Amino acid sequence: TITPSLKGFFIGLLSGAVVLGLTFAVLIAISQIDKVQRS
Amino acid sequence: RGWFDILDDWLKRDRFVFVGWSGILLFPCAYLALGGWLTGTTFVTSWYTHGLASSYLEGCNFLTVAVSTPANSMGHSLLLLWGPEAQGDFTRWCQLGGLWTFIALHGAFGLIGFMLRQFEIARLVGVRPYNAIAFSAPIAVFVSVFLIYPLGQSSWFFAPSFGVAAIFRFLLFFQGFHNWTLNPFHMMGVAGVLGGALLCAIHGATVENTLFQDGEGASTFRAFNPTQAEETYSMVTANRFWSQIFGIAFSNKRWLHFFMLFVPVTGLWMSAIGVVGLALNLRSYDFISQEIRAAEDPEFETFYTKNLLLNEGIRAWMAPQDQPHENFVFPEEVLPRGNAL
Amino acid sequence: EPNPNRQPVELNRTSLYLGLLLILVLALLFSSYFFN
Amino acid sequence: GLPWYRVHTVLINDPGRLIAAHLMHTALVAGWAGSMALYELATFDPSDPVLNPMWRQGMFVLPFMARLGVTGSWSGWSITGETGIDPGFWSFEGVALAHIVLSGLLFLAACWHWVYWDLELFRDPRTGEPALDLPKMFGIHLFLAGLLCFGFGAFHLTGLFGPGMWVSDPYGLTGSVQPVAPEWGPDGFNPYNPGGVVAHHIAAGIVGIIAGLFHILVRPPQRLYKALRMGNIETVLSSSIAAVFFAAFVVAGTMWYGSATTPIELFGPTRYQWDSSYFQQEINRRVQASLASGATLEEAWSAIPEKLAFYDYIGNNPAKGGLFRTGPMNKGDGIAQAWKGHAVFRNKEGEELFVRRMPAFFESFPVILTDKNGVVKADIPFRRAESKYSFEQQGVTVSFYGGELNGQTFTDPPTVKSYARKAIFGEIFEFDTETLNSDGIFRTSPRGWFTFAHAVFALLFFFGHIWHGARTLFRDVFSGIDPELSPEQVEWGFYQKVGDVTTRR
Amino acid sequence: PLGISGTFNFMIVFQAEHNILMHPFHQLGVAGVFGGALFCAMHGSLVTSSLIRETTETESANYGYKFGQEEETYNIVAAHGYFGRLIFQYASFNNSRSLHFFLAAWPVVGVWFTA
Amino acid sequence: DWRVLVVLLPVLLAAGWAVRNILPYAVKQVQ
Amino acid sequence: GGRIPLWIVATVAGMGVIVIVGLFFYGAYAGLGSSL
Amino acid sequence: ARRTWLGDILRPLNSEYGKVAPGWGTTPLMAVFMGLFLVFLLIILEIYNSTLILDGVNVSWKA
Amino acid sequence: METITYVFIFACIIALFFFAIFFREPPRIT
Amino acid sequence: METITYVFIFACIIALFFFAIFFREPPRIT
Amino acid sequence: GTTGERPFSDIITSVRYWVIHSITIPALFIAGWLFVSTGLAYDVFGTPRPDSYYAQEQRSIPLVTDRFEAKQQVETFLEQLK
Amino acid sequence: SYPIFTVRWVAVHTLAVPTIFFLGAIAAMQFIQR
Amino acid sequence: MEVNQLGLIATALFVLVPSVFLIILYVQTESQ
Amino acid sequence: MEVNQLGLIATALFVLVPSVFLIILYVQTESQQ
Ligand code: CLA
Ligand code: CLA
Ligand code: CLA
Ligand code: CLA
C-alpha cells in the first residue's frame, strides 16, 4: 500500500536529488570550463 | 586530475567571496533562512497559529514583526511543505507555521556550513582553527534554545519566535515560568558575556593608551604598518599600570588572547546547559528551605519570595493570550493582584 | 626497563591562583543550591 | 613540563599503556555498576509494585536489569510482586557481584599491561616504532560487535537461549519479561513495537558481521587514508565521540518520548501522557463501559485499578521536577498509600463540574471548575470582595467514587476546597509524608534524570568531537603556524587557488 | 538592592514600570555587550589562531611569548588573510590600532547608551 | 489572474534593458 | 568608468534612503498600525 | 621488545600499518551505502515524527 | 552551619586576593 | 551512610596494602 | 591585492552602470509595490486583509487545533466568512 | 580588462534585487487603510 | 533553616578535592 | 540508625586533611630527583 505521505515522501526525495543534481552539474560544468592554470 | 580535483580547484579559487566545498552547504542554507525570515516578517501572519498579526503587511513595525512558531497542535512536526499537514499547499504552509521550521532547519545547516567554512579556510591559509572552536558556543546556544528546548516541551509552539518583541516575550516567559534568573547556569552565562564585553573594552582601551609614538601626527592610526615586526604598544607599561591600579595585570600576550576566547565561549556553553535542563522543566525555581520557613512564618520575607509573587503574576496574566490553544478562562476574581493595582 | 614516554607535569603559581579562584567562586555560587 | 590538561597525552604512542588506561576505565565503570546496584538493593522497598514502584524510589540501574530479564532478589521477592521465587544465580545480587568481580579482574589486567608495556605486538616489524593498524582493528572490532549484536538479538531477546525483555500492555498495568519474536515488516520501525528491537539486532548484527569482514579484508583507499589521517589515532577519537554523541542524543530522545525499550513500569510515565490525558481517557472509557452494563457509579469507579489511577496524577509527570530538588519522588509528595477515589464535584443546581487540570508548565495553578461545556461555574477567588463563583456562593460539593472514600460526600466548603486543590493534579491519593519527611514538592522521575544527563553529555561531547577533530586535521600547526610563512599565501590574488603555491601569477 | 535576587527584583519591576525591553537604548546595551563578547571571542580566537610556532607540542604555547619581547607573537597578516576570506577582504582589519580602537569603542558606547 | 502579469511586467523590462546594454560586453566571455 | 563623481552618488543614495525611511515613520502614524 | 606466545599468534593482525588501496579504491561504493543509510535514517525519523505515515504502523503506545 | 560555610568561602577568596597581589610571580623583562 | 564509610575506609586499606607490597621502594644493596 | 574583479568604486561611478540601473531598480520597486496594491500578496501568503480576521459577529480567533486535519480547519474558517 | 559576470555579481544580485522588490512592497503598505 | 544536611559535605569536598589537586601539582613544580 | 549527623564530615576530613598533607610532601619529594 502506498500512502499519501509516502507519495509526499517520494516527492521530497526526488526534489532533493534534482536540486542536488543540478547544483553539481552546473558546478562541474563551470569548473571544467574555467580551469585554474599551473606552471 | 579527475573531475573531483578540477571541481576542488574552482571551489577553492581566490575570489571576492570564497566558496569552497563548505559553500555548497552554507550559501543556500543561509540565504534561505534569511529569505524565509524577511519574506515572513514582511508578508506572513501568525493569526491561525497564535492569534497574532506578525508582518508589515498587517501593520506591524520592525520591532513587532516575527516569523512565529507553529500551532501547538502540530507538535514537533517537521512541517515539510510536502508533508501531511500542508500537503504541498504553499499558502496553507505559511498559515500553519511552516516558515518557522523552514528557517530553523535551514539556519541550523547554515551554521554547520559556516563552521565548516572556518575549518576549510583555516586549513588552506595555514592557521590554527581556534576561530572555528569559538564558534561552537553560538552553535550550542542555537541548538539548545531553538531545538532541544522545544523538543522537551509539548511542541515547537514554545520555542522562540523569530522577532524582536517575540524574543522579549520569550525572556519574560522564562522569568515567570522557569525562574531562569535564579539558574546558576544562566548566571555563569551572564558572567561570561558581561565578562567578555569587559575584556573587549579593557583590552582595546589599554592598547590604544599604551601605543608607542611611531609617527608624528595626532591621528595615531597611520603609524602602524601591518608588516612591521615590532609591538605597536608597550606590554611593559600597560602591565605596570594595571599592576598598580587593579593589583594584577596580564604579562603574557598569548595567555591574554586565549583568555579572551575562553571567557565568552565558556559563558555561552554554560547557559546552553541550563536551557537543556529547562527543556525538561528541570528548573532552579525554588529554595526549599526558604519555602518551608515562609509557609510557617508569615513575617519572613526576602527578595526571593518577592520575586516569586512577580512570577505568579506573569503566569496568570500572560497565559490565556500567550497559550491560546489551552482555552484558559480566568475570571477577574482569581487573578492575583496586590492592593489597588 | 624504563618507559620512554614519561613526561613531567607543571602548574605555575599564576595557574594555581587562577584555579583556586575558579573553584572558590564556583563553591560560593553552587553552595546555596546544595543546601537548598 | 606538560600542562595539567595534557597529562594523558603520554599514552598516544604507547599502545600497551593505552590498553592499561582503558582497562582501568572499564574496571571503574563495572565497579560503579556493582556499587550502584548494591546501594539500590540496600534501599529498595519491594513490598508494593502498585503505588511504590522502583521509579518512585529513585532507582536508576534497577530498571536496566529488570529491562533485560533480571527480576528477582536472592531474598525471594520479585519486582512483579511474586513471592517465593528462585532466581538462581542471576538475581540483582548476583548481577551486582559479577560486576565487582569483573572490576577486580580488570584492575589486575591493567597492572599487567602497564608494567609490561613493551610488547613486540605493538611495534611495526619493518621499522620498530610503535604502530597500530587501525583499519584492521576496526574490521576486527566491527566483526565482534556484529556477532554480539546478532547473538543478543537471536538468543537473548527471542528467548531461544535467554529470558527475553520487558514488555507490557499500552497502560503499563501488566508488564513482565517475555520472549519477543522479531517483527520483520515495516512496523519493526515503529519505536513502540518490541519485535522491531529483536529484528533490529538480528539484521544489523548480520550487516555488522559482513561489514566487519569487508573491513578486515579490504584496505582503505589512499585518498581516504590521507583525508581522514588514518595513521593517527586521534582520528578515531574524533569519529568515536561523534558516534557516541549521536547515540547519546537518540537514547535521550527515546527516553523522553517513550519507546518499547523505556517502558513506563520501570521509568515512569512520560510527560506526553499527561499532556494528552492518555490515562484519563482510558479510565473514562472503562467507566463508560461499566455504566453501559448498568453498574452504579460506585461500582464502575470501584473497578478502576489503583495502578491505572496512579498514572493519572501529575506527581508522576517527569516534567514537574526541579534541578536541585534531590532524591526519590517519595521525598516530594510522599510514599503513595491508597487511591482516595475519583472525586465528582457538583454545584447546588445538581450539575457536575470538572476541575481544570494543572498543565506541566505551572508551578502553581488556580482552581477553576467548568461544566461539560467549559463554562466557568466555580473557582477559588483571590480577591473576594466581588467574587461571583466562590464555592460558598455556588454550593459546590464533592462526592467520591471508588477508592478509600467511595460513597462519601463532603459539603463544608473548607473540605471541598482542599479536594479541589488536589484535583488539579488529577486523581487524589493518600500519601505517607512522615516516613521520609517529605517536603511536599514535586521531584522528577528517573526518566527525567536520565534524559537531562544524556542530553547534556551529548552536547558536551559535540565539543570534544570538534576539538579532537580539529587536532587531527591541524596537527602540523598545533604548536603554532610556520614562523617563515610567505605573505603571498595569505594576500589576495597572488595564487589562483587558495593555499596552493603551484597556481602562482 | 545590593544583592543577587534583589538585582532581579529591580529588573522585573523596571520592566513593568518602563518597557525597557522596548526601549532602543537598552537594545543598544544588548548590542553593546553581546557584540563586545562576540568581538572578544573573535579577537582572542584570531590572535590565538595565528600565534607563531615557538614551542613544541608538549609545552603550553604560552611559553612562546616572553614578557617585554620586542617582536609580535602572532602573524596579523595571516589573521587578516584567514578572516578576510571568511567574509571578504575589507570586512577585516589590517591595522591593529583601528582594530583595538574598535574593540574599546563598541561596548563602551553600548554601555553608555544603556546607562 | 491579470495580477500575476502586472507584478511581473516591469521586471521583464528590467532584464531587457540590462541585456541590451551589456549584450556586447557580455559576449567576449568566449575563450 | 569614473565619470560620475563618488560624492554625488553618495549624496543621492543617502537621500533616497532618507525618503524610504521617512516614509516608514510616516506610516507608523497613518493607516494600519497607527492605532487609529 | 618482549615477545610472548599471544604476541606471536596475534602478530599478523597488527602488521599492515600503512597499507592502502591505490587511488580512490572503494570510495564510490562507500558513497552508495551512505546514500542508502541516509534515505533509511530519514525514513525512521519521519515515521517517528508522524510526517511519514504508513499502513499498519501506529506510532503509539497502543502498539 | 550554612552561614559559616558561605562566610568561610568568602574569607578564603579575600586571602587569595592578598597572595595573588603581594605574592605573585613577578613579571620580568627577558 | 555510616556503613558506606566503614567499608570505604576498609577498602582503602586493602588498596594501600597492594601498593605497599608491589609498588614499594625496592631495597637495594648499598 | 586584487582577486581580479572590477572595483565597486569604478562601477558605481561608471555611466554604463547608471544607464542599466536607472531602469532595473525602479522596475523592481514598482513590481514590489504592485505585488501589494493589486492585493496579490494577501492571496499568495494567506494573510488576512483588515476585513477578514474575524467574522462580523465573532470574537474568537480561528486557531488550528488538529495536526492532520489542519489545512481543512483553516479552509473551514475562511468559508465561515462569506 | 575585467569580467562583469562573476560569482560576486551573483552574490550581490541575489540580495540586491529582492531587497528593492521588498522595499517597494513595504512602501505601498504605508498607504493601506483599515 | 531546614537546609539539606549533605549540602555541607558536598560543599566541603567540592572545594577540598580540586583545590588539593592544584596544590599538589604546584608544589611539585617548584621543587624542581 | 540515629547516628550523629556530623560524624560523616568529621570522618571525611579526618581522613582527607592529613592524607593530602602526606601526598603533597611525597610528590614534591619524588620530583626533586
Ligand atoms: C544546501 C542545500 C540544502 C539543504 C541542506 C536543505 C535542507 C532542507 N531543506 Mg531546503 N532547499 C534548498 C537547499 C537545501 N535545503 C534549495 C536550493 C531550495 C530551493 C528550491 C530549497 C527549498 C526548500 C523547501 C521549499 C523546503 C526545503 C526543506 C528542507 C528540509 C527537508 C530536506 C529533505 O527532506 O530533503 C529530502 C531529500 C534528500 C535528503 C535528498 C536525497 C538524495 C538521494 C536520493 C540520496 C539517496 C542515494 C541513492 C539511493 C544512491 C546514490 C548515491 C550517490 C552518492 C551517487 C531540510 C532542512 C523543507 C523544510 O524546511 O520543511 C520544513 C521545505 O519544505 N527546502
Ligand atoms: C528489518 C530490519 C530492521 C528493523 C526492523 C530495525 C528496527 C529499528 N532500527 Mg535498525 N537497522 C537495521 C535493520 C533493522 N532495524 C540495519 C540493517 C541497520 C544497519 C546496520 C540498522 C541501523 C540502525 C540505526 C543506526 C538505528 C536503527 C534504529 C532502529 C529502531 C528505529 C525506531 C527508533 O526508536 O528510532 C529512533 C532513531 C531515529 C529516529 C534516528 C535518529 C535521527 C536523528 C535525526 C539523528 C540525530 C542527528 C543529530 C546528531 C541530532 C542533533 C540534536 C538536535 C537536533 C536536538 C528500530 C528498533 C534506530 C534506533 O536504535 O533508535 C533507538 C537507530 O538509531 N537501526
Ligand atoms: C561481560 C559482559 C557483560 C554482561 C552480560 C553485562 C550485563 C549487564 N550490565 Mg554490565 N558491564 C560490563 C559487562 C557486562 N555487563 C562491562 C565490561 C562494563 C564496564 C564497561 C559494564 C558496565 C555496566 C554499567 C555501567 C551498567 C551495566 C548494566 C548492565 C545490565 C544491562 C545492560 C544494558 O542495558 O546494556 C545496554 C548497552 C547498550 C545499549 C550499548 C549498545 C551498544 C551501542 C549501541 C554501541 C554501538 C556501536 C557498535 C560498535 C556499532 C555496531 C554496528 C552494527 C551494525 C554491527 C546487564 C545486567 C547496567 C546495570 O543495571 O548495572 C547495574 C548499568 O548501568 N553494566
Ligand atoms: C547518568 C547519570 C546518573 C543519573 C541520571 C542518576 C540518577 C539518579 N540518581 Mg544516581 N548516581 C550517579 C549517576 C547518575 N544517577 C553516579 C555516578 C553516582 C555516584 C556518585 C550516583 C549516586 C547516587 C546516590 C547516592 C543517589 C542517587 C540517586 C539518584 C536519583 C536522584 C538524583 C538526584 O537527586 O540528582 C541531583 C542532581 C543534581 C543536584 C545535579 C548536580 C549537577 C551540578 C550542578 C554540577 C555541575 C556544575 C559544574 C561544577 C559546572 C562547572 C563549569 C566549568 C566546567 C566551567 C536519580 C534517579 C538518589 C536516589 O534516589 O537513589 C536511591 C541517591 O540517593 N544516585
Ligand code: CLA
Ligand atoms: C572518549 C572520550 C575522550 C577521551 C579519551 C579524551 C582524551 C583526551 N582529551 Mg578530550 N575531550 C572529550 C572526550 C575525550 N577526550 C570531551 C567529551 C571533551 C569536551 C568537553 C574533550 C575536550 C578536550 C580538550 C579541550 C582537551 C582534551 C584533551 C585530551 C587529551 C588530554 C586529556 C587530559 O590529560 O586530561 C587531564 C584532565 C585532568 C587531569 C582533570 C580533568 C577534570 C575534569 C574537568 C572533570 C573530571 C570529570 C570526572 C572525573 C567524571 C568523569 C566524567 C565522565 C563520567 C563522563 C586526551 C587525549 C586535551 C588535548 O588535546 O591535549 C593536547 C585538551 O586540551 N579534550
Ligand SMILES: CC1=C(/C=C/C(C)=C/C=C/C(C)=C/C=C/C=C(C)/C=C/C=C(C)/C=C/C2=C(C)CCCC2(C)C)C(C)(C)CCC1
Ligand atoms: C522563503 C522561501 C523561499 C525563498 C525566499 C527568499 C530567497 C526570499 C528573499 C528575500 C529577500 C532577500 C528579501 C530582502 C529584504 C530586504 C529588505 C526589506 C531590506 C530593508 C532594508 C532597510 C530598511 C535598510 C535601511 C537602513 C536602516 C534600517 C538603518 C541603517 C540605514 C539603512 C538605510 C541601511 C523559496 C523561494 C525557496 C520558496 C519557499 C519559501
Ligand SMILES: CC1=C(/C=C/C(C)=C/C=C/C(C)=C/C=C/C=C(C)/C=C/C=C(C)/C=C/C2=C(C)CCCC2(C)C)C(C)(C)CCC1
Ligand atoms: C581487587 C580484586 C577483587 C575485588 C574488587 C573490588 C573490591 C572492586 C570494587 C570496585 C568498586 C567499588 C568501584 C567503584 C567505583 C565507582 C566509581 C567509578 C565512581 C565514579 C563516580 C563518578 C564519576 C561521579 C561523578 C559525579 C559526581 C561525583 C557528582 C555528580 C556528577 C557526577 C555524576 C558526574 C576481587 C576479589 C573481585 C578479585 C580479585 C581482585
Ligand SMILES: CCCCCCCCCCCCCCCCCC(=O)O
Ligand atoms: C503529495 C505532496 C504534496 C505535493 C508536493 C509538492 C511540493 C513540492 C515542493 C518541493 C520543493 C523542493 C525542496 C527540497 C529541495 C532541497 C532538499 C535537500 O537538498 O535536502
Ligand SMILES: CCCCCCCCCCCCCCCCCC(=O)O
Ligand atoms: C543459574 C540459573 C541461570 C543459568 C545461568 C546461565 C549461564 C550464564 C548466562 C549469561 C550470558 C551472558 C552472555 C553475554 C555474552 C558476552 C560474552 C563475552 O563477552 O565473553
Ligand SMILES: [Fe+2]
Ligand atoms: Fe589584542
